[PDB]
Amino acid sequence: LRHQSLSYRCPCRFFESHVARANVKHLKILNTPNCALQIVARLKNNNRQVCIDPKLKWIQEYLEKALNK
Amino acid sequence: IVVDTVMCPNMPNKSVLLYTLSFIYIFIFVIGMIANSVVVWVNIQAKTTGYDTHCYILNLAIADLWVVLTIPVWVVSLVQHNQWPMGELTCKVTHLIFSINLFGSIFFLTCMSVDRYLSITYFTNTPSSRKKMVRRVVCILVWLLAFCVSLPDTYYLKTVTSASNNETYCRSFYPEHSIKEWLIGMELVSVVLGFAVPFSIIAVFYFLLARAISASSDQEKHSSRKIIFSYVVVFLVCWLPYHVAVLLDIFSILHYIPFTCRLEHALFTALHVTQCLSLVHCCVNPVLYSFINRNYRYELMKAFI
Amino acid sequence: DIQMTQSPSSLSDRVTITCRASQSVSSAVAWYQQKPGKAPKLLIYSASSLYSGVPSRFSGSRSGTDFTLTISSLQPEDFATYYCQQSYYYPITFGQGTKVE
Amino acid sequence: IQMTQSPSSLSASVGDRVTITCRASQSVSSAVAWYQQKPGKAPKLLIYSASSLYSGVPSRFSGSRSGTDFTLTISSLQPEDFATYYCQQYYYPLFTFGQGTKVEIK
Amino acid sequence: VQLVESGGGLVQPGGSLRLSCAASGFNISSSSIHWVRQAPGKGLEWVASISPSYGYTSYADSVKGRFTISADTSKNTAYLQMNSLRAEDTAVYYCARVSYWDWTWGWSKYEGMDYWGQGTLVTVS
Amino acid sequence: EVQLVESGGGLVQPGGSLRLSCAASGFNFSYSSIHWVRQAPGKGLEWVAYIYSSYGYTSYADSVKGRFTISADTSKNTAYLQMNSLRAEDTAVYYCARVYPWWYYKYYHGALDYWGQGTLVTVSS
Ligand SMILES: CC(C)CCC[C@@H](C)[C@H]1CC[C@H]2[C@@H]3CC=C4C[C@@H](O)CC[C@]4(C)[C@H]3CC[C@]12C
Ligand SMILES: CC(C)CCC[C@@H](C)[C@H]1CC[C@H]2[C@@H]3CC=C4C[C@@H](O)CC[C@]4(C)[C@H]3CC[C@]12C
C-alpha cells in the first residue's frame, strides 16, 4: 500500500530477454517525459504486448535505424 | 516486422491537479489530527470514570493518528511533481510508518466487526478478566502481523536520481530477476489482505449481527438498524475506488489496455484523487465509532467543559 | 475465590460502606440491597454509575481496590443488607453484608 | 566524480595486443563508453554500455568489467588504429572523460 | 421482562431436585442467567451461570461436580438440576439476569444483576 | 544521412559572447538529446552541457555552470549554445553530438553516437 508519490509511472517497469526476432510483429517506441525512451512489442503467438529490453543488440540497432528515416 | 513511434506530450495541467489535491490534503491532515487525538485522550481519560473502554478503539485511533501524521512529507513530495529532495533513510522510514499503521487500522476494523457479534452471542457470560486478556493478545498479534507484512516493501526501496531528467526520486528496486513477480506479489498482498478478506469478514459479521438484533426485541428498540449498514457502506466507498484504480494500473502495466496519452492522464489523475479519498478513511473513522455513540458524546462533552 | 472483605458489618446521615478485594478488579464492583425476605435490587453497577430509577442519594466511588458506597442523605427506606460484589473474576463473590439500623 | 585511465601513454606494433584500464571513484553500473580521437578529427564511438560493440566498429575491439575497473582490449593491432583513446562514464547526470592513452609505435 | 421461580420444597438429603426460572420479555439469547442462594440467616452466594446462546456454563467451587444448568431457548427459561443435596444446602434461591446492550459496545460499562426473581425455597431435612 | 553542422565560430574578445548554432538533419530531432563537448588546444575532451530536445531538460558542467545556456527548436532542427562571460581559458574546439536516451533499469543510454565537425573559438584581445 505504498503512496503513489513513491510510485514510478512508466509504460514499462520490467522487461523480458527471451524474445526472438522470428516471433515479433509490431515494435513501438514511447518517448515519455519521466521515463525517456522505452519499447513495447507484440508477438505473433501470444498476441500480447510484452515489453522489450534495449540491451538486445538487434532490437537497439533496428530501432535506431528506423528513427533515422 | 513493422515499427511505430509515439510521443507522450508533457501534461499541461499537472500543476493544477496537484495543487488542488494539496489543498484537500491539508484539511485531511488537520481534521485527522484533531479527531484521532481527542478520541485517544477520551479513551484514556474514561477508564478513571469507570467505563470499560475497548482496546481496539484505542489502537485504531493510534494507527490513524500515525498515518495522518505522515501526510506532510507526502505533500512536500507532491508539490514538487513527485521528486524526492530528502535522503534515502527518510523515504524508507516514512514508507514503513505509513504502511504498518495503515494496515493496522484496516485489521482493527475487521477485529471489532467480529468482536461485536462475539460479544452479543458468545462472550455474553465471560468474566471481564478473560475477555480483556483475549483482547490484549489479539491486539499484540495484529500489530505484529502488520509489521511483518510491511517490512518487505520497505527493504527493497531506494532513492535515485534520473540520469536524463536530472531529478531525484524514491522508488522500489526489486531483485533484477524477479521484478515482475515482486510487483504483482505485493499488489495481491495489498488487495487480498487489504480489501478482499477484511471487507468480506466485515460484511458477513455485520449482517449476522443485524439478523441477531432483529431476532431480539428489547435491543432493537435502543439500537440503530441503518448504522450497521452505514459502517459497511462507508468502508466500501472509502476503499473500493482506490483499489479499483490500482487494479486498473496493473492491468495497464501488463498491457491489457492499449496505450494512449489520454489513458495515462486519466490513470494519473484517478490514482492520485482516489488516494486522497482513501486517506479520508482515517479522517472519518473517529466519527463512525466514537462520535455517534451516545456514551462517547456524553463523556467527551464532560471532558470538554 | 477472590475473597471480598466488606466492612463494617454494622452501622448506627453520612453512611459509608467500604469494600476491598484481595486482587485488583478493574471497576467491576457492584452493589445491592435486599430488604428482609425480599430479592436484592441493584443500586450501582460498574464503579459509580447509578441504575435508572434509583434515587440520587446513592453514590459510588473507587480507589484502585478500596471501593466504597456513599449515601449522604439517609432515608427510612434505605434499611437493608447491602452486598458488595465483584464480577471481574469468576466465581462471583459477594461481600459479608452491612446491615444498617 | 573522477574517471582515471592508465597508462597515460602506450606503445605497440602491428600484430600485437594492447590493453587500456579505466577506473572510477564511485560505482557505475556498466555505464561507460570508449572513444578514439584521431589527430585532428572529431572522436568516433567504439563501445557503449560495458562491452556492446557499435554497429560499424571492427571485431577486435572488446570491453570488460570488474567492479569499477573497465579494460578495453585490442588484438591483432592494425596500423590505422594508432590514435588517442578516451574513457567516458554516463551513469551520473554530469559526464566525464578519461585523460587519454596514445598508442604509439615501438 | 419478569422472572418467576418455580420449584423448592422439602426433600431429604441425598436425593435429586430441579428448579426453573421462567422469563417473560427479552429473548433469552442476549443475556446471561445466574443463580444465587441465600442460606438461612446467611449472606448471598453465587451458584452457577449460563449463556444460552452457546452454553458457556460456570459453577462455584463448592458445587462443581454435582450440579447442572441448562437454558431452554425455545420457551425462554432456565432449568437447574440438583443432585445429592446437603444439610446446609437449604437456602432461598434466586434467579437473576445480567443484561447486555449493543447500543453501548465500544464504550461500555460493567453491567451487573438487575432483574431478580422472588425465588424458591429448598430444604434438606 | 545523419549530419550535424556547427556554425558561428571565430575570433572573440573576453567578457563577450558567441552564438554557436548546431543544425541537425537526417533524424527525428525531437526523439533525442544534444550534447555540447569541448576540446582545449592539444588536450583531451571535456563534456560541457547538453539539452533534451522534446521536454527541454538541461545540465551543465561545474566549470561552465550558469554561464552557458542551451535552447532548442525542433521546427528547424536547431540547438543554440549562447555562451557569455568568456575567458581566455575558454579557447577550444567545440563539438555538437546527439544521443537517443534509451531507458535501462538503472541508467540511461548516453553514448554519443554521432559527432559534429566542430568549430574553433578563441578568447583574447
Ligand atoms: C516507529 C515504527 C517502527 C513503528 C510504527 C508503529 C508504532 C507507533 C507502534 C508499534 C507497536 C505499537 C504499540 C503496540 C502495543 C500497544 C499497547 C496498547 O495498549 C497501546 C498502544 C501500544 C503502546 C502501541 C502504540 C503504537 C506502537 C508503538
Ligand atoms: C485480516 C485479518 C487481520 C483478520 C484476522 C481475523 C481476526 C479478527 C481473527 C483471527 C483469529 C481469531 C481468533 C481465533 C480464536 C478465538 C477463540 C474463540 O474462543 C474466541 C475468538 C477468538 C479469540 C478469535 C477472535 C477473532 C480472531 C482474532
Author numbering:
A (entry chain B): 0 to 68
B (entry chain A): 27 to 331
C (entry chain E): 2 to 13, 18 to 106
D (entry chain C): 3 to 108
E (entry chain F): 5 to 129
F (entry chain D): 4 to 128
What does the paper say about this structure?
In contrast, ACKR3 does not activate G proteins and is intrinsically β-arrestin biased. To address these questions, we used cryo–electron microscopy (cryo-EM) single-particle analysis to determine multiple unique structures of ACKR3 bound to a series of agonists: wild-type CXCL12 (CXCL12WT), CXCL12LRHQ (a higher-affinity variant of CXCL12 with alterations at its N terminus), and the small-molecule agonist CCX662 (13, 14).
We also determined the 3.3-Å structure of the CID25-ACKR3·CXCL12LRHQ-CID24 complex. CXCL12LRHQ binds to ACKR3 in the same unique orientation as CXCL12WT despite differences in interactions with the orthosteric pocket, suggesting structural independence of the CRS1 and CRS2 sites. Despite having an extra residue (L0) at the N terminus followed by three residue substitutions (RHQ) relative to CXCL12WT, CXCL12LRHQ recruits arrestin with unchanged potency and efficacy. In the orthosteric pocket, the backbone of CXCL12LRHQ aligns with CXCL12WT and makes many of the same receptor-chemokine interactions. The major difference is that CXCL12LRHQ-L0 packs in a hydrophobic pocket formed by the side chains of ACKR3-L1283.36, ACKR3-F1293.37, and ACKR3-S2165.43, which likely explains the slower dissociation of CXCL12LRHQ relative to CXCL12WT. The CXCL12LRHQ-R1 side chain is oriented similarly to that of CXCL12WT-K1, whereas the CXCL12LRHQ-H2 side chain extends into a pocket formed by ACKR3-W1002.60, ACKR3-L1042.64, and ACKR3-Q3017.39, which may also contribute to the slower off-rate. The 4-hydroxypiperidine ring of CCX662 projects deepest into the pocket, where its hydroxyl group is positioned to form a hydrogen bond with the side chain of H2696.52. Both CXCL12LRHQ and CCX662 appear to induce a similar 1- to 2-Å outward shift of TM5 residues 212 to 219 relative to CXCL12WT, likely due to the packing interactions formed by L0 and the hydroxypiperidine ring, respectively. CID25 binds to an extracellular epitope that includes elements from both ACKR3 and CXCL12, and CID24 binds to the cytoplasmic pocket of the active receptor.
